[PDB]
Design an enzyme around this catalytic site. Structure first.
Site, PDB file in Angstrom:
ATOM      1  N   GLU A  24       0.865  -1.208   0.081  1.00 42.84           N
ATOM      2  CA  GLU A  24      -0.153  -0.039   0.022  1.00 42.84           C
ATOM      3  C   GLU A  24       0.828   1.300   0.104  1.00 42.84           C
ATOM      4  O   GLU A  24       2.121   1.238   0.301  1.00 42.84           O
ATOM      5  CB  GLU A  24      -0.862   0.016   1.346  1.00 42.84           C
ATOM      6  N   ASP A  25       0.362   2.330  -0.474  1.00 39.86           N
ATOM      7  CA  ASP A  25       1.096   3.534  -0.285  1.00 39.86           C
ATOM      8  C   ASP A  25       0.877   4.379   0.962  1.00 39.86           C
ATOM      9  O   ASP A  25       2.135   4.437   1.863  1.00 39.86           O
ATOM     10  CB  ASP A  25       0.384   4.656  -1.340  1.00 39.86           C
TER      11      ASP A  25
ATOM     12  N   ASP B 166      -4.565   6.177   5.861  1.00 38.98           N
ATOM     13  CA  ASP B 166      -4.954   7.108   6.492  1.00 38.98           C
ATOM     14  C   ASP B 166      -6.205   6.730   7.679  1.00 38.98           C
ATOM     15  O   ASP B 166      -5.689   6.524   8.636  1.00 38.98           O
ATOM     16  CB  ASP B 166      -5.795   7.986   5.419  1.00 38.98           C
TER      17      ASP B 166
ATOM     18  N   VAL C 179      -0.081  14.417   1.842  1.00 42.90           N
ATOM     19  CA  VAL C 179       1.170  14.266   1.143  1.00 42.90           C
ATOM     20  C   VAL C 179       1.026  13.909  -0.433  1.00 42.90           C
ATOM     21  O   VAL C 179      -0.078  13.589  -0.851  1.00 42.90           O
ATOM     22  CB  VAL C 179       2.114  13.070   1.737  1.00 42.90           C
TER      23      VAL C 179
ATOM     24  N   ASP D 273      -0.430  10.916  -5.665  1.00 43.36           N
ATOM     25  CA  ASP D 273      -1.012  12.237  -6.417  1.00 43.36           C
ATOM     26  C   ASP D 273      -1.451  13.190  -5.622  1.00 43.36           C
ATOM     27  O   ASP D 273      -1.772  13.147  -4.339  1.00 43.36           O
ATOM     28  CB  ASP D 273      -1.910  11.766  -7.355  1.00 43.36           C
TER      29      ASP D 273
ATOM     30  N   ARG E 283       2.774  12.441  -9.356  1.00 50.19           N
ATOM     31  CA  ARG E 283       3.023  10.972  -8.873  1.00 50.19           C
ATOM     32  C   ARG E 283       4.605  10.920  -9.549  1.00 50.19           C
ATOM     33  O   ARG E 283       5.136   9.868  -8.709  1.00 50.19           O
ATOM     34  CB  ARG E 283       2.095  10.123  -9.550  1.00 50.19           C
TER      35      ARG E 283
HETATM   36  N1  LIG Z   1      -1.916  11.284  -2.216  1.00 46.79           N
HETATM   37  C1  LIG Z   1      -2.503  11.129  -0.955  1.00 46.79           C
HETATM   38  N2  LIG Z   1      -3.244  10.183  -0.904  1.00 46.79           N
HETATM   39  C2  LIG Z   1      -3.883   9.717   0.361  1.00 46.79           C
HETATM   40  C3  LIG Z   1      -3.454  10.409   1.438  1.00 46.79           C
HETATM   41  N3  LIG Z   1      -4.089   9.994   2.473  1.00 46.79           N
HETATM   42  C4  LIG Z   1      -4.817   9.076   1.999  1.00 46.79           C
HETATM   43  N4  LIG Z   1      -4.574   8.893   0.657  1.00 46.79           N
HETATM   44  C5  LIG Z   1      -5.207   7.825  -0.065  1.00 46.79           C
HETATM   45  O1  LIG Z   1      -6.640   7.403   0.501  1.00 46.79           O
HETATM   46  C6  LIG Z   1      -6.186   5.836   0.334  1.00 46.79           C
HETATM   47  C7  LIG Z   1      -6.826   4.888   1.600  1.00 46.79           C
HETATM   48  O2  LIG Z   1      -6.952   6.229   2.859  1.00 46.79           O
HETATM   49  P1  LIG Z   1      -7.808   5.342   3.877  1.00 46.79           P
HETATM   50  O3  LIG Z   1      -8.848   4.318   3.318  1.00 46.79           O
HETATM   51  O4  LIG Z   1      -6.876   4.673   4.934  1.00 46.79           O
HETATM   52  O5  LIG Z   1      -8.471   6.277   4.686  1.00 46.79           O
HETATM   53  C8  LIG Z   1      -4.822   5.541   0.414  1.00 46.79           C
HETATM   54  O6  LIG Z   1      -4.537   4.413  -0.353  1.00 46.79           O
HETATM   55  C9  LIG Z   1      -4.479   6.493  -0.622  1.00 46.79           C
HETATM   56  O7  LIG Z   1      -4.471   6.358  -2.251  1.00 46.79           O
HETATM   57  C10 LIG Z   1      -2.460  11.620   1.206  1.00 46.79           C
HETATM   58  O8  LIG Z   1      -2.028  12.236   2.355  1.00 46.79           O
HETATM   59  N5  LIG Z   1      -2.218  11.678   0.107  1.00 46.79           N
END
Ligand SMILES: Nc1nc2c(ncn2[C@@H]2O[C@H](COP(=O)(O)O)[C@@H](O)[C@H]2O)c(=O)[nH]1
Ligand SMILES: Nc1nc2c(ncn2[C@@H]2O[C@H](COP(=O)(O)O)[C@@H](O)[C@H]2O)c(=O)[nH]1
Lengths: 166, 166
Positions: free
Chosen positions: B89-90, B93, B143, B149, B155
């Site tokens: 995963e990237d 959050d 970020v 992105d 990216r």
């Molecule tokens: N570019 C970017 N994407 C984020 C960031 N925070 C969350 N995301 C995107 O939201 C997806 C899932 O977030 P989550 O389900 O944990 O709330 C991550 O895989 C990512 O693609 C951030 O700070 N920057």
């Protein structure tokens, strides 16, 4: 556990690959100055080439990922109509796959389409397709590594290697 | 044309990222010795992390790519039943997306599942999800770069940067 090269006729080091990808990135940056390219990565084999290439292109750009097989597994998500598109491929063999993809992309009427491919085996070419940014032209051989697989394995080798026809 | 960092509170250099990814790769190699992991990259944000990570894991392995959104765009192609799966995963959050994905993968009964994520913002965590291989834990901020992105752009920055809440 160590990365080991096959015994095929084609071998290209991570360093050689690194240097060539940086030159291609610089070429694209220069050619597309003043523009915003949309790079389309052809999964799965080109994802590493894509990763290194984009980091060598100091321009504002967008990207997408699609899958396709000879004779369209993953569809496009971002619009390409009116965009300056750059297809990122792993290797051009017979050219059939790239030929279908270009026709597919052209149907949506992009502003332009250019092709970047890490490798090309022109002796195997059956359909003439364009490659504006070529990493290396190689002899006929089944290569793998640097994203390219060998029965789904070895995509993680940091270098390009190959096996013998036998 | 040059890569420029945003003014947000989070900044991580290509060198720092490079070193951390190499350590994680070494960790995985050690933990999975004697095994054949199947790494699943979560597109699109994790494809660069994936590219560098796999090249730092000296083991025989396979991979796949899938897309998913909060509250499953691209499906799995290779079997995961009985496989030792590693999700790539990237950034984590709220943890919602990863939570859904893990349940999805577990339904197919893999032999094991571990998670590798470049980043994590635990102050934003709403659902407790596991991260066995974490690059960096960071404060709450949006970020981008290194695959991640900012409205589809940036990216390609070789480093991780961010913007101000404003
Ligand atoms: N570019 C970017 N994407 C984020 C960031 N925070 C969350 N995301 C995107 O939201 C997806 C899932 O977030 P989550 O389900 O944990 O709330 C991550 O895989 C990512 O693609 C951030 O700070 N920057
Ligand atoms: N791993 C690997 N894949 C190849 C090789 N040659 C062709 N391919 C695969 O076949 C696809 C298209 O081949 P083509 O349509 O040009 O004949 C390429 O994108 C690539 O995935 C090779 O030598 N090694």
């Amino acid at each position: 556990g160590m990365f080991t090269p096959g015994n095929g006729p084609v071998q290209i080091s991570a360093e050689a690959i690194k240097k060539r990808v940086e030159e291609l990135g610089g070429e694209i940056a220069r050619d597309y100055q003043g523009k915003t390219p949309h790079l389309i990565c052809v999964l799965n084999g080109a994802f590493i080439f894509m990763a290194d290439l984009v980091r060598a292109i100091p321009l504002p750009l967008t990207m997408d990922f699609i899958a396709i097989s000879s004779y369209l597994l993953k569809d496009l998500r971002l619009p390409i109509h009116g965009r300056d598109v750059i297809v990122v491929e792993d290797i051009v063999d017979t050219g059939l796959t790239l030929s279908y993809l270009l026709d597919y992309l052209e149907a949506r009427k992009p502003a332009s389409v250019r092709v970047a491919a890490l490798l090309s085996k022109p002796s195997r070419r059956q359909v003439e397709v364009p490659i504006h940014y070529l990493g290396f032209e190689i002899e006929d051989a089944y290569v793998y590594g640097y994203g390219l697989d060998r029965a789904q394995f070895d995509r993680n080798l940091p270098f390009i290697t190959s096996i013998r026809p036998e």
